[PDB]
Amino acid sequence: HVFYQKFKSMALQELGTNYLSISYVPSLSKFLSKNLRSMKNCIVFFDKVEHIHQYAGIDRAVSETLSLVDINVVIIEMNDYLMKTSDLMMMVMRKINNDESIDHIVYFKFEQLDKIEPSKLTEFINVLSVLEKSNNIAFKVLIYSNSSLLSTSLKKKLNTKYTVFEMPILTCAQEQEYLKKMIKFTFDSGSKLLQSYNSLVTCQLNNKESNLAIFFEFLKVFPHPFTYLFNAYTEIIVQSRTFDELLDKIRNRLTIKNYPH
Amino acid sequence: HVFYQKFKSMALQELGTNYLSISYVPSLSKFLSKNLRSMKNCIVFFDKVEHIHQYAGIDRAVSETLSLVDINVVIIEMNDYLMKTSDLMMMVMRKINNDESIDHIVYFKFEQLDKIEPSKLTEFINVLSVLEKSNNIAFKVLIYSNSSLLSTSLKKKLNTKYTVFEMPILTCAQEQEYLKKMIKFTFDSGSKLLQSYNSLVTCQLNNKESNLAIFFEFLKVFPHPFTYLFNAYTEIIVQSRTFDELLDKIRNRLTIKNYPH
Ligand SMILES: [Cl-]
Ligand SMILES: [Cl-]
């Protein structure tokens, strides 16, 4: 009679979606479609990407923007290549040789989030300058950092001007507001089951001495609050077998000493 | 260096999405936008809804179709009312009195999936006949079953003709094919991390003597395979703290004696 599996599955998908959301930075979604959903070559830097939560969010937003593209898109992960006619050129061309469409987009991805062979870097800027010369082939170099030598080498040797996206540092208040949004669900709007779930969350968050409120006070000091909350919360949802078991965990079992494990 | 949290969160959202997918029944998505995204009153029956997996899927598809509607949408859950000027009329009108838009859509939801006061049923068909008389107000009665007295009472007393949607019974082969699709992920297309994950799944499913293949043989006989697989799989993803831990569980720990718990 009380289909918790329907709630469970929908809550798990929304919590997933909520975490990967980049709505706190509306300027980003527009910045992506502008640079990614075109036939213009560009190099994008993502600075102040200080959290795995942020990286996952940017990545999904990139992943989706490339899905909108009505031209062949190829992915090359440059991490394994650099951090260690040409090897790279041969590999890029093999991928691009897909007789899918006349126009192609090569998306080169480089991630330096825990901050590089000079010889390997030059070989890369060489492939990039050849794709610059090619009409029908466009490149999107996406670098995730926070690099110094990279920016200066890419600027000096190429004709494509690079753009930079500064990931906003949230205030404790902004962070708290967005962490609460993360565990608020919007599926089956108007339903008493969603009303019960969201009312309990809202009221416990406003009750200073509650497990949920106390848990959130810790997230103010914790370095990666979105991930700590996401892990703790997916566990309570997954481990609960009934709707009442879920409410009981939010009210009585959610503590930093209990979740995640 | 190997951001499993990015994979974990994306895999959890996709597994969520995959479960709630109604792509196996493309005729349904079109049937919904036709009947729900209009200003015409209609009564829809969902017969042969034999699984909680199916119900969750139909519900989300309904939930999304109503999001497309550019007119005020109100939800009334008739379950609590019937199974037990008028009480109902007063409540429906209170909701509809939202000074949001001139036109309103009342979505009445009734679920009889484990199969009703005659007095309560008449009161409902009375509210429905008054909304029929009202221009600017449309109703969408959605009944989920498998009812006999309901269909005949709704047909006899109302001017709105009812439609029926027969949920297709999947063959063992269809079921197996779709259960495999459920645990195949499409985020970060082209990435070696997604390639590793999907190759392991594909190869283990083809290896008759593997944990994954043996697990799937049980799903052929199990009455609710999508839910049993979803629960077992969200656990392995959630409980794993590294990418290697995940692969180890799929290869060595996934059994009917171990998952879900
Ligand atoms: Cl975080
Ligand atoms: Cl099922």
Side-chain angles (χ1 to χ4, degrees), chain A residues 2-29 31-36 38-39 41-47 49-82 84 86-93 95-111 113-116 118-154 157-191 193-207 209-216 218-256 258-261, chain B residues 2-29 31-36 38-39 41-47 49-82 84 86-93 95-111 113-116 118-154 157-191 193-207 209-216 218-256 258-261:
Chain A
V2 190
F3 306 123
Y4 179 62
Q5 190 60 55
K6 182 162 93 58
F7 186 83
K8 182 158 162 191
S9 73
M10 279 184 182
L12 273 142
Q13 192 212 36
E14 204 171 357
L15 189 64
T17 296
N18 287 354
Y19 184 84
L20 306 167
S21 167
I22 50 109
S23 308
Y24 57 91
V25 57
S27 41
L28 175 69
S29 333
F31 175 73
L32 290 184
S33 78
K34 176 208 142 212
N35 294 270
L36 291 169
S38 71
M39 206 58 206
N41 319 276
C42 204
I43 299 147
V44 179
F45 286 93
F46 294 114
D47 290 71
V49 174
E50 289 150 6
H51 304 282
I52 200 58
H53 165 242
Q54 301 180 292
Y55 176 42
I58 296 145
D59 202 49
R60 176 53 76 110
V62 158
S63 183
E64 281 297 279
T65 305
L66 292 181
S67 301
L68 180 138
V69 183
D70 73 329
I71 256 76
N72 183 268
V73 183
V74 152
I75 319 299
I76 284 136
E77 296 169 280
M78 290 309 292
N79 285 283
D80 208 63
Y81 200 81
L82 316 162
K84 280 178 169 172
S86 79
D87 326 335
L88 184 49
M89 184 76 71
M90 267 263 272
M91 182 250 280
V92 175
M93 297 299 151
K95 286 202 158 175
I96 283 174
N97 230 88
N98 55 75
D99 303 298
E100 289 265 273
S101 60
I102 282 160
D103 300 300
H104 308 270
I105 286 168
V106 207
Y107 148 57
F108 299 93
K109 167 215 186 78
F110 184 71
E111 166 269 300
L113 289 180
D114 279 285
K115 209 200 172 200
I116 318 103
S119 48
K120 287 302 210 186
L121 175 53
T122 320
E123 199 170 341
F124 178 40
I125 305 161
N126 288 357
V127 174
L128 295 178
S129 76
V130 167
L131 303 183
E132 233 168 44
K133 290 170 187 279
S134 330
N135 38 293
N136 304 118
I137 304 148
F139 63 81
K140 316 291 181 159
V141 184
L142 276 62
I143 310 113
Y144 301 89
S145 208
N146 306 110
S147 180
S148 19
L149 61 116
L150 183 87
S151 185
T152 39
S153 208
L154 270 293
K157 283 180 71 69
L158 295 179
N159 285 123
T160 280
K161 266 94 88 283
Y162 71 92
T163 174
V164 169
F165 198 84
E166 202 72 46
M167 220 58 197
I169 319 296
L170 293 183
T171 73
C172 186
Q174 287 184 279
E175 165 213 278
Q176 224 65 5
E177 188 205 312
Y178 287 125
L179 285 158
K180 291 165 196 154
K181 285 188 189 171
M182 200 185 116
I183 63 172
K184 298 296 190 76
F185 305 138
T186 72
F187 59 87
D188 314 315
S189 286
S191 77
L193 193 76
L194 193 81
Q195 228 123 268
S196 306
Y197 170 83
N198 291 320
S199 295
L200 182 83
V201 182
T202 300
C203 297
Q204 287 255 299
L205 283 161
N206 292 334
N207 181 336
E209 301 287 68
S210 71
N211 282 49
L212 200 49
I214 282 153
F215 189 92
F216 268 65
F218 168 80
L219 303 170
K220 298 190 178 170
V221 302
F222 194 76
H224 298 273
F226 286 86
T227 299
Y228 198 98
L229 180 67
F230 183 79
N231 297 333
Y233 232 72
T234 64
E235 281 179 32
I236 65 167
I237 301 160
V238 158
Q239 296 159 192
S240 296
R241 288 193 65 194
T242 67
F243 190 65
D244 307 81
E245 218 167 290
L246 178 68
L247 306 170
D248 171 86
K249 293 186 187 185
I250 303 170
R251 215 157 25 212
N252 317 307
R253 291 219 73 252
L254 190 60
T255 52
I256 68 159
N258 292 347
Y259 289 96
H261 33 251
Chain B
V2 190
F3 306 123
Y4 179 62
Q5 190 60 55
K6 182 162 93 58
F7 186 83
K8 182 158 162 191
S9 73
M10 279 184 182
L12 273 142
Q13 192 212 36
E14 204 171 357
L15 189 64
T17 296
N18 287 354
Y19 184 84
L20 306 167
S21 167
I22 50 109
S23 308
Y24 57 91
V25 57
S27 41
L28 175 69
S29 333
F31 175 73
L32 290 184
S33 78
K34 176 208 142 212
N35 294 270
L36 291 169
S38 71
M39 206 58 206
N41 319 276
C42 204
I43 299 147
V44 179
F45 286 93
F46 294 114
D47 290 71
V49 174
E50 289 150 6
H51 304 282
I52 200 58
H53 165 242
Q54 301 180 292
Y55 176 42
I58 296 145
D59 202 49
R60 176 53 76 110
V62 158
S63 183
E64 281 297 279
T65 305
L66 292 181
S67 301
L68 180 138
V69 183
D70 73 329
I71 256 76
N72 183 268
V73 183
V74 152
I75 319 299
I76 284 136
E77 296 169 280
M78 290 309 292
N79 285 283
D80 208 63
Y81 200 81
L82 316 162
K84 280 178 169 172
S86 79
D87 326 335
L88 184 49
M89 184 76 71
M90 267 263 272
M91 182 250 280
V92 175
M93 297 299 151
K95 286 202 158 175
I96 283 174
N97 230 88
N98 55 75
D99 303 298
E100 289 265 273
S101 60
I102 282 160
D103 300 300
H104 308 270
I105 286 168
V106 207
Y107 148 57
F108 299 93
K109 167 215 186 78
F110 184 71
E111 166 269 300
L113 289 180
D114 279 285
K115 209 200 172 200
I116 318 103
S119 48
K120 287 302 210 186
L121 175 53
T122 320
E123 199 170 341
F124 178 40
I125 305 161
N126 288 357
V127 174
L128 295 178
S129 76
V130 167
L131 303 183
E132 233 168 44
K133 290 170 187 279
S134 330
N135 38 293
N136 304 118
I137 304 148
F139 63 81
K140 316 291 181 159
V141 184
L142 276 62
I143 310 113
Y144 301 89
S145 208
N146 306 110
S147 180
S148 19
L149 61 116
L150 183 87
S151 185
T152 39
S153 208
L154 270 293
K157 283 180 71 69
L158 295 179
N159 285 123
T160 280
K161 266 94 88 283
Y162 71 92
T163 174
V164 169
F165 198 84
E166 202 72 46
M167 220 58 197
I169 319 296
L170 293 183
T171 73
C172 186
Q174 287 184 279
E175 165 213 278
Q176 224 65 5
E177 188 205 312
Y178 287 125
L179 285 158
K180 291 165 196 154
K181 285 188 189 171
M182 200 185 116
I183 63 172
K184 298 296 190 76
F185 305 138
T186 72
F187 59 87
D188 314 315
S189 286
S191 77
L193 193 76
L194 193 81
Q195 228 123 268
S196 306
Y197 170 83
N198 291 320
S199 295
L200 182 83
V201 182
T202 300
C203 297
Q204 287 255 299
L205 283 161
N206 292 334
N207 181 336
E209 301 287 68
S210 71
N211 282 49
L212 200 49
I214 282 153
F215 189 92
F216 268 65
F218 168 80
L219 303 170
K220 298 190 178 170
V221 302
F222 194 76
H224 298 273
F226 286 86
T227 299
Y228 198 98
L229 180 67
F230 183 79
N231 297 333
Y233 232 72
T234 64
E235 281 179 32
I236 65 167
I237 301 160
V238 158
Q239 296 159 192
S240 296
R241 288 193 65 194
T242 67
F243 190 65
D244 307 81
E245 218 167 290
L246 178 68
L247 306 170
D248 171 86
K249 293 186 187 185
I250 303 170
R251 215 157 25 212
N252 317 307
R253 291 219 73 252
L254 190 60
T255 52
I256 68 159
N258 292 347
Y259 289 96
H261 33 251

